[PDB]
Amino acid sequence: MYYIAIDIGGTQIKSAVIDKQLNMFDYQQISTPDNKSELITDKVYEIVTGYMKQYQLIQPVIGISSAGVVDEQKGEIVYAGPTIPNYKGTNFKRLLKSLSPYVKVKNDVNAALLGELKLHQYQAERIFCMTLGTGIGGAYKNNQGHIDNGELHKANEVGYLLYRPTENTTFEQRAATSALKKRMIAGGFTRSTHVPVLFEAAEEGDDIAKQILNEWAEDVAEGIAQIQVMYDPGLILIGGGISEQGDNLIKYIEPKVAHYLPKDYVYAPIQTTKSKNDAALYGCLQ
Amino acid sequence: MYYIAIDIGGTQIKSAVIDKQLNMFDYQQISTPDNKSELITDKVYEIVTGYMKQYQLIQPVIGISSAGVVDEQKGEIVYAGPTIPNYKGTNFKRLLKSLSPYVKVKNDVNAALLGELKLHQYQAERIFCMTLGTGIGGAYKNNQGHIDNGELHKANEVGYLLYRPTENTTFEQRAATSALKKRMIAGGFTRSTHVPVLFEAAEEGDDIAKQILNEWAEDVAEGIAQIQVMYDPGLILIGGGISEQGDNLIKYIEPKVAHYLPKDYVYAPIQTTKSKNDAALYGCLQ
Numbered sequence: 024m025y026y027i028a029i030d031i032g033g034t035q036i037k038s039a040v041i042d043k044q045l046n047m048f049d050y051q052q053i054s055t056p057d058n059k060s061e062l063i064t065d066k067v068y069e070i071v072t073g074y075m076k077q078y079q080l081i082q083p084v085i086g087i088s089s090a091g092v093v094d095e096q097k098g099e100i101v102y103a104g105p106t107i108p109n110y111k112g113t114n115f116k117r118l119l120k121s122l123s124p125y126v127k128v129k130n131d132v133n134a135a136l137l138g139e140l141k142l143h144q145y146q147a148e149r150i151f152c153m154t155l156g157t158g159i160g161g162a163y164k165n166n167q168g169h170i171d172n173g174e175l176h177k178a179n180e181v182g183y184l185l186y187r188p189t190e191n192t193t194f195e196q197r198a199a200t201s202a203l204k205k206r207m208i209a210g211g212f213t214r215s216t217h218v219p220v221l222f223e224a225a226e227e228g229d230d231i232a233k234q235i236l237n238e239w240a241e242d243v244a245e246g247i248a249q250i251q252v253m254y255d256p257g258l259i260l261i262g263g264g265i266s267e268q269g270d271n272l273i274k275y276i277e278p279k280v281a282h283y284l285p286k287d288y289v290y291a292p293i294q295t296t297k298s299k300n301d302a303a304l305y306g307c308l309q
Numbered sequence: 310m311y312y313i314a315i316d317i318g319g320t321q322i323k324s325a326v327i328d329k330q331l332n333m334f335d336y337q338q339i340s341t342p343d344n345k346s347e348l349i350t351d352k353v354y355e356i357v358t359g360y361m362k363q364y365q366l367i368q369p370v371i372g373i374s375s376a377g378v379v380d381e382q383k384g385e386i387v388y389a390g391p392t393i394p395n396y397k398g399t400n401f402k403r404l405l406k407s408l409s410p411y412v413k414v415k416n417d418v419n420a421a422l423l424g425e426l427k428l429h430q431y432q433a434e435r436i437f438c439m440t441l442g443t444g445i446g447g448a449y450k451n452n453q454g455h456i457d458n459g460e461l462h463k464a465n466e467v468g469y470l471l472y473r474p475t476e477n478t479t480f481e482q483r484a485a486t487s488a489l490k491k492r493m494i495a496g497g498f499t500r501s502t503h504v505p506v507l508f509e510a511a512e513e514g515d516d517i518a519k520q521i522l523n524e525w526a527e528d529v530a531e532g533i534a535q536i537q538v539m540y541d542p543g544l545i546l547i548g549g550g551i552s553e554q555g556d557n558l559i560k561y562i563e564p565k566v567a568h569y570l571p572k573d574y575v576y577a578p579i580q581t582t583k584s585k586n587d588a589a590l591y592g593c594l595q
């Protein structure tokens with residue numbers, strides 16, 4: 024009993040102690056260090072030792088969910104995009120090799136998917152999870168219940184989909200939070216800089232907010248269409264902080280998916296994840 | 310806009326940036342430093358500068374909610390219980406003077422009540438708020454909308470109520486959330502040390518868990534009865550971490566309050582707070 028879980032993303036580092044029965048205690052959310060004067064490895068070390076002293080844990084099982092391409096066996100970040108500077112090469116097993124030899128590392132979306140499936144039951148046999156946020160990532164659980172990470176650990180890096188040579192942009196470069204916030208300013212949305220306010224303003228009938236959301240949702244849908252064509256999944260789950268919007272998110276994306284598929288093509292239902300925040304923390308220990 | 314809000318408790322320090330429209334962003338929640346080799350002052354300073362850098366805020370309006378007797382004018386902790394060691398004398402106005410002259414400091418319950426009333430409207434003219442958690446605190450907003458803190462700032466230190474000389478224990482020593490954890494252990498509840506698990510177990514028919522909850526609720530009700538008698542409030546709000554149990558906590562307490570009142574005595578409705586986690590973060594800026 025008493026596992027330590029840490030979920031690292033470009034915006035926040037989340038942590039908690041989880042028991043054998045899936046009960047979460049001592050949740051701790053902090054703004055991600057810049058990885059320049061403040062180090063993610065130092066913050067991760069501090070979180071582990073804090074939980075160790077707090078609960079007198081000897082060689083505890085530590086689970087690590089992280090953005091970036093993850094080599095599970097190595098416990099290492101083999102490639103990272105630009106969101107987290109100087110991240111490539113980060114090895115968590117070596118970092119904590121004095122506190123515990125029991126360290127697991129997974130990609131953020133694999134963790135989110137395993138977590139969501141640990142907490143909620145679905146009829147669908149094939150489930151693809153796509154998270155929207157700082158970055159766009161993916162994970163697929165097949166009919167035999169297996170998640171394939173790829174020959175080089177980079178399966179489902181869906182942010183790399185749909186490179187437009189004339190715009191020099193990937194899916195991620197048009198649909199991640201930093202891109203949407205730039206689209207809000209370009210769209211004429213001066214009201215706020217926060218995505219929830221954009222959603223709120225659109226619910227109130229602000230035409231401006233709606234045009235930004237619909238155009239952005241057009242690109243999200245295009246990416247989902249490619250995922251659908253390839254996997255033919257029973258269910259597509261949308262994860263990430265924006266998952267909080269629920270049906271107010273689905274209503275903008277879901278209908279648009281049909282624009283990139285043939286008229287009689289049946290695609291999977293598109294839904295937000297039921298677990299809106301702690302999914303990856305449970306997933307990294309699975 | 311952009312106000313910095315920090316809520317310091319014996320268990321955790323929560324922080325967030327809040328805008329003019331009451332939108333909460335960059336929420337953070339860390340375990341409370343031990344205040345020995347790790348200082349709360351340093352962490353608060355660290356949290357404020359971090360938000361200043363992230364948003365390029367100059368002399369930002371800073372709000373501080375804290376457990377302990379608070380001298381609002383001085384912005385200082387005048388007395389603290391045995392929860393946070395070396396807390397007495399902590400002065401937040403002085404500590405943050407190098408960053409902003411706009412600092413406000415309040416007791417955690419005053420902040421909770423002001424916070425809950427800022428996000429939720431009630432018909433009741435007089436509202437008492439009691440929080441259950443690491444300790445037990447209280448606050449009273451009268452029919453004139455004013456909260457009287459007392460001649461020596463210790464008004465509504467409700468944890469000192471009902472001292473029992475045969476047991477050498479106060480209300481706070483029998484009804485504090487951590488007193489409930491001690492009671493679960495002494496009552497033979499080995500299944501877990503997590504209070505929500507005691508609630509789950511009782512819902513599923515665990516008689517030992519039901520007994521621990523009813524005995525504990527009896528002492529909570531007793532304290533509420535004294536508060537009701539003095540104030541005759543229009544509403545009693547229950548805040549604190551245990552407030553997340555909502556109606557499942559109320560069903561244990563409300564009926565029992567009548568046991569310490571006369572047969573035809575009408576007491577106020579007792580409800581959990583609506584803003585469960587962040588009430589104090591909104592309240593400390595009022």
Ligand SMILES: CC(=O)N[C@@H]1[C@@H](O)[C@H](O)[C@@H](CO)O[C@H]1O
Nearest residue numbers: 090091092103104132158159160
């Ligand atoms: C190369 C890289 O960094 N890819 C990450 C991916 O691992 C992660 O799943 C996703 C969501 O956080 O964000 C991408 O940018």
Ligand SMILES: CC(=O)N[C@@H]1[C@@H](O)[C@H](O)[C@@H](CO)O[C@H]1O
Nearest residue numbers: 376377378389390417444445446
């Ligand atoms: C003397 C003292 O510290 N009293 C605190 C009180 O200020 C606080 O409101 C309450 C809830 O946290 O806990 C009590 O123990």
